[PDB]
Design a protein around this ligand. Structure first.
Ligand SMILES: CC(=O)SCCNC(=O)CCNC(=O)[C@H](O)C(C)(C)COP(=O)(O)OP(=O)(O)OC[C@H]1O[C@@H](n2cnc3c(N)ncnc32)[C@H](O)[C@@H]1OP(=O)(O)O
Ligand SMILES: [Zn+2]
Length: 254
């Protein structure tokens, strides 16, 4: 409800939840954000004056992944604090609960961009705690509405496990999951398991995949495979081939 709509580059985005934008922006139906620095402003003309002095065309961070027109920037909440606070405020417009927006230091932010001649456009992000005893490989994940349901969410989840695999660890998303988070991960874990079985132990599956034992076990249970169900494997393999956004591990500079 507050705010209700944002203008974000060429996009009008309807918000899902309130976000605690600093007072006088918390009481505004519409916000105008710079698409590259995520600064919030109260009018189109103020945004237009800002685009004239803002020099950013991408996130203020190292690009750790690029393939064709897709990039991932690794942003450190300890270094690019303002930007990461602006990103958390944006994210909260599509999250029912987030931790308070100005403690970003404990996190790294993996920012997804679709790139063209006008720059690297924010699609979404996942955050990740630098030091985490629960071994959560994602704390938060968000794809902007205008890009939702195109495979960007799965790509990011896939990308989160590639980091896990490269740190020599199995990882898991932070719980509680939102309903949308639950559907996304379930959809991801099923397809990874079905595809691996098509192309092939739970501990071995865990090592190849970076998905933790718990999530494999419960996904296997959900599929009543905890035991190969050939019909289900074949049908999924037919569903696939019927993933244009897809992680290539060799494109990782990390
Ligand atoms: C770890 C956590 O913190 S949980 C928090 C999760 N994040 C949020 O709730 C923020 C708001 N939601 C979002 O940002 C997104 O919905 C995400 C990140 C969860 C998923 O992003 P998307 O880009 O939509 O992902 P993608 O297109 O890869 O879809 C993944 C699966 O979720 C399904 N899905 C996506 N949106 C919806 C929806 N509105 N209703 C039901 N299912 C949906 C897709 O159909 C797909 O399942 P399928 O393969 O069985 O069809
Ligand atoms: Zn800007």
């Amino acid at each position: 409800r507050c705010p209700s709509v944002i203008e974000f580059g060429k996009y009008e985005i309807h918000t899902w939840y309130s976000s605690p934008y600093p007072q006088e922006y918390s009481r505004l139906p519409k916000l105008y954000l710079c698409e590259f620095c995520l600064k919030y402003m109260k009018s189109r003309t103020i945004l237009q004056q800002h685009m004239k002095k803002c020099g950013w065309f991408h996130p203020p961070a190292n690009e750790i992944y690029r393939k064709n027109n897709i990039s991932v920037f690794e942003v450190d909440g300890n270094v690019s604090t303002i930007y990461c606070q602006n990103l958390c405020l944006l994210a909260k417009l599509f999250l029912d609960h987030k931790t308070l927006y100005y403690d970003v230091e404990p996190f790294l932010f993996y920012v997804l961009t679709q790139n063209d001649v006008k720059g690297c456009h924010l699609v979404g992000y996942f955050s990740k705690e630098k030091h985490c005893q629960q071994k959560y490989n994602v704390s938060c994940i968000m794809i902007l509405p205008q890009y939702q349901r195109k495979g960007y969410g799965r790509f990011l989840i896939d990308f989160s496990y590639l980091l896990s695999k490269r740190e020599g660890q199995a990882g898991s998303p932070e719980k509680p999951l939102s309903d949308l988070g639950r559907l996304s991960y379930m959809a991801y874990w099923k397809s990874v398991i079905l595809e691996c079985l098509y192309h092939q132990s739970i501990k071995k599956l865990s090592k190849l995949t970076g998905i933790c034992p718990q999530d494999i076990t419960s996904t296997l249970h959900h599929l009543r495979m905890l035991i190969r169900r050939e019909k289900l494997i074949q049908d999924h393999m037919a569903k696939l081939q019927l993933r244009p956004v897809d992680v290539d591990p060799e494109c990782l500079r990390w």
